[PDB]
Design a protein around this ligand. Structure first.
Ligand SMILES: O=C(O)CSc1nccc2ccccc12
Ligand SMILES: *[C@@H]1O[C@H](CO)[C@@H](O)[C@H](O)[C@H]1NC(C)=O
Length: 347
């Protein structure tokens, strides 16, 4: 059940402090399915708050203290009872140590105290995994939670193009974005809010975004591509979107903590706004819960939207991509308007 750590052989691809990045691997011979999960954990957009993050969240900025193994949980689990969806797949857990929402491509030098290479970590991991079985893969599912979910949206197309120009058009690259579908909305009450943090982060990380999204918003406005409802329509790879309607990180950046009318309308409008952004997303799972992340939580099989679980919804999504399905829905968005109106929400 354990995934074994492999630091990157290309030591030029580093975490924030210059230590090498890496990945955790549990191989599954006899399986051409490969799951590459992107860890979340917020971000940092200037020297000062990155220094604070280095004091108290150093494992998200450095590999010096990483454990040698890690137990696969939820969709990374290998037992069918915990992971009905992809229990037999090759499991990859990519630690989040770049603090850049998996967007940076900047090395640390005399002018940069930290390296932000999240976009290069994903590519270098994919490159070093071909020699360990990925070259024979049939499906590469790029998954991620929180900032890792947004990292899927930023990197799923880049993963497909890298394998294309490397002589592997048979590997079908897909994305699974969990809790990374954020809104650049107005805060309930008025450090940089959210939309200004990404604006400064891109310049601080020299972050990169999907090409077609970059061409729409152009120079100075690439921060728009960090938000799912604006970057998703420009992606070519199939992406399944998992999003709590009332995400805790979304409420945090909205300064939402007996609910009076003003806050009630704000919460119900947020749930409404998120539903609207998913109306055109065919493969989606959006329960009306106040929570954060799901796909690597051990009890991720418990939540249901309209009677269908997330593992089943992901199974139906696989079927839909096998070249319209009866009793196998892929678009599952709660309609009720308040946190925990879905009885299967976590407690
Ligand atoms: O990683 C985590 O737990 C939270 S990440 C996060 N939160 C809120 C808004 C964001 C916007 C853009 C990108 C990431 C965002
Ligand atoms: C290591 O990674 C860097 C940055 O992505 C790249 O420029 C370099 O060519 C890589 N080296 C090898 C041997 O792959």
């Amino acid at each position: 059940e354990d995934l074994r750590l492999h630091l990157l052989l290309n030591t030029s691809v580093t975490c924030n402090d210059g230590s090498p990045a890496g990945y955790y691997l549990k191989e599954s011979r006899g399986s051409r399915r490969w799951l590459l999960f992107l860890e979340g954990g917020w971000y940092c957009f200037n020297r000062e708050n990155c220094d604070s993050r280095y004091d108290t969240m150093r494992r998200l900025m450095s590999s010096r203290d990483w454990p040698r193994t890690r137990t696969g949980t939820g969709i990374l689990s290998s037992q069918p009872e915990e992971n009905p969806y992809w229990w037999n797949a090759n499991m990859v857990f990519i630690p989040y140590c770049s603090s850049d929402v998996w967007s940076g491509a900047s090395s640390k030098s005399e002018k940069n105290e930290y390296a932000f290479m999240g976009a290069l970590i994903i590519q270098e991991v994919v490159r070093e995994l071909l020699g360990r079985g990925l070259s024979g893969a049939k499906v590469l599912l790029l998954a991620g939670s929180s900032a890792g979910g947004t990292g899927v949206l930023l990197n799923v197309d880049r993963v497909a193009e890298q394998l294309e120009k490397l002589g592997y058009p048979a590997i079908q690259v897909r994305g699974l974005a969990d809790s990374g579908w954020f809104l650049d909305n107005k805060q309930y009450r008025h450090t940089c809010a959210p939309t200004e943090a990404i604006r400064r982060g891109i310049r601080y990380w020299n972050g990169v975004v999907p090409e077609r999204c970059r061409r729409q918003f152009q120079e100075g406005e690439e921060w728009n591509c960090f938000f799912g409802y604006k970057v998703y329509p420009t992606l070519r790879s199939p992406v399944f979107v998992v999003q709590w309607l009332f995400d805790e990180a979304q409420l945090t950046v909205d300064n939402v903590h007996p609910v009076q009318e003003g806050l009630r309308l704000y919460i119900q409008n947020l749930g409404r706004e998120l539903r609207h952004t998913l109306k055109d997303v065919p493969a989606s799972f959006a329960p009306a819960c106040l929570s954060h992340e799901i796909i690597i939580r051990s009890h991720w099989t418990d939540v249901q939207v309209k009677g269908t679980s997330l593992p089943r919804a992901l199974h139906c999504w696989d079927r839909s991509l096998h070249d319209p399905l009866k009793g196998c829905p892929v678009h599952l968005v709660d309609s009720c308007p308040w946190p925990h109106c879905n009885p299967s929400c976590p407690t």
